[PDB]
Amino acid sequence: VAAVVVVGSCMTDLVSLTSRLPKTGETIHGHKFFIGFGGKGANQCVQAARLGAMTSMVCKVGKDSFGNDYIENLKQNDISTEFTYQTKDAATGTASIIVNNEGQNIIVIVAGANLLLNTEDLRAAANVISRAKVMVCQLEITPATSLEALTMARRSGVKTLFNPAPAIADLDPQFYTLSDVFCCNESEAEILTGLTVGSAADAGEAALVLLKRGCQVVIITLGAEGCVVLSQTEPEPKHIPTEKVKAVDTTGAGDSFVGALAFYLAYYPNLSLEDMLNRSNFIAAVSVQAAGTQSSYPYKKDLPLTLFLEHH
Amino acid sequence: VAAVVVVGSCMTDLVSLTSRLPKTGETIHGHKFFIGFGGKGANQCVQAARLGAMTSMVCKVGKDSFGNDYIENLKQNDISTEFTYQTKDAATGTASIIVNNEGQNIIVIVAGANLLLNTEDLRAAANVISRAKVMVCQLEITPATSLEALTMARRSGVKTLFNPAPAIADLDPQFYTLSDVFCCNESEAEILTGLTVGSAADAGEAALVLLKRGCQVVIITLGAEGCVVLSQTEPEPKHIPTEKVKAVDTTGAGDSFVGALAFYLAYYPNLSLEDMLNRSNFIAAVSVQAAGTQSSYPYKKDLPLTLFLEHHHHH
Ligand SMILES: [K+]
Ligand code: NA
């Protein structure tokens, strides 16, 4: 029985490493190409699974080589693919990424088959969703499909974790009211609220705007400064700091954080929110110490045992 | 027995269509992505094969999904893959292409497994090369590997067709002396000669510089204006114009021209050069009338019969 269900995106990353980023009109040579596995949904699901969660990934890929490889990737991480759909009508989602030596990049995203996961595809996952502890969604699929997933989780009493990413200025108000935990980064809070968010102080103001739109719990992540959290029961913003790490590659760190959070909501429901966020920050910080996205996400066996212990 | 042997590159084109080109730090959404088969070597080989040539493609791709697809592509076009090596040590060559609405683009080429085709890989192909009629090379693999292929073709009396593309300013002088036919576009001739080439008249000047570096025959293609040719035996530049066509997509047209030329050098060696070029220009023009590079290259069955005739010689 899957405790964590993720309804979201799978993306094939097509990565070229270069010394400079090309300008308009330019043909350059890079020195390495490789294929990686990405997509916010799948990323979050993978981190949760590597922590030991039983997870199920509801998504749609193409009936093509990239899609068959994605399915294999999910299976290699012990994620159930019972509701991973394939379609001839579009290609697997792709992110074309060029990265220079400085680590800066340009990214072209074609969502493809991700945009065709529909309400019928979710209905078929209804038993699975009703038995889960947590439902996770983002904004990389059709927004109506994510809404319907959250609506189903609410109806069955399943906790909803919503990560509004990438953020849009005009977000449907139901996303807030259907979210038990609403988690985003500074950058995304700036878009959703129109406010500046550089510091913990700023974040507390933005989180309150979001809380008043109807979320139960709001979490704004602040990168190296940890995160701020507010809830209906504890509306005072609370800052949760993180011990400074050495960062190799921060790609996918937000997804590592949300996946860890899903894991703790599902298997350690009686931990305090502050304690879950401390542990999730730690795990994310491990991921920033290695390159890659999914390949940098730590397994339970490689993490300290105190992250998996809980007092009475 | 392969009459046309191509020693060169296979490249997977990963194309994203967008409305704007992204800048540093930017993520944008495009509206379509697709995969195409490219690489100058393979393109040339595919055109030659669709004209009826028995070809063999000496190249190296990765032991990955793209490489298996490429090998399947070559077989689907009836090209011998005996010396299409696969290596677990690098990925198949890739060109990542982003294209905006204005039609402008950003291209990132990682040559990959193509750069690992070495002289030992060619020495294993030695029998195949010695039995061919034409050896075709470009500059998308390690230049030393192309040189050694041309040297091996010369020793066995095999005709050498060399396409210096992409062009480099400091090209090893042996490429000229090892080339029976040296074929490039205006743009490449500018790089190799350092001259300006904006007309047929200018192209004749640049061709003479190249001829004087040691080529037997020099051909500079001029897109819609056809081509200019000169040789050791006929050094006066000759402009060979072609029928005007309405161009849908010119991508891969130069490769269609070289592949056609290889086909004619191999199977119609007694046609005059001018005649081969007239036919090759026509074939390349057909390719520009459809989209999609290799999928635009015409098959013999779809081309006029007179392209495959020779006065008093059956084919
Ligand atoms: K990382
Ligand atoms: Na074409």
From Swiss-Prot, chain A:
Its main location: cytoplasm. One of its GO terms (cellular component) is nucleus. ATP binds at residues 185, 221-226, 242, 254-255, 281. It comes from the Eukaryota. Requires a divalent cation, most likely magnesium in vivo, as an electrophilic catalyst to aid phosphoryl group transfer. It is the chelate of the metal and the nucleotide that is the actual substrate. Its EC number is 2.7.1.15. Substrate binds at residues 11-13, 39-43, 140, 255. This is Ribokinase. It comes from Homo sapiens. The gene is RBKS.
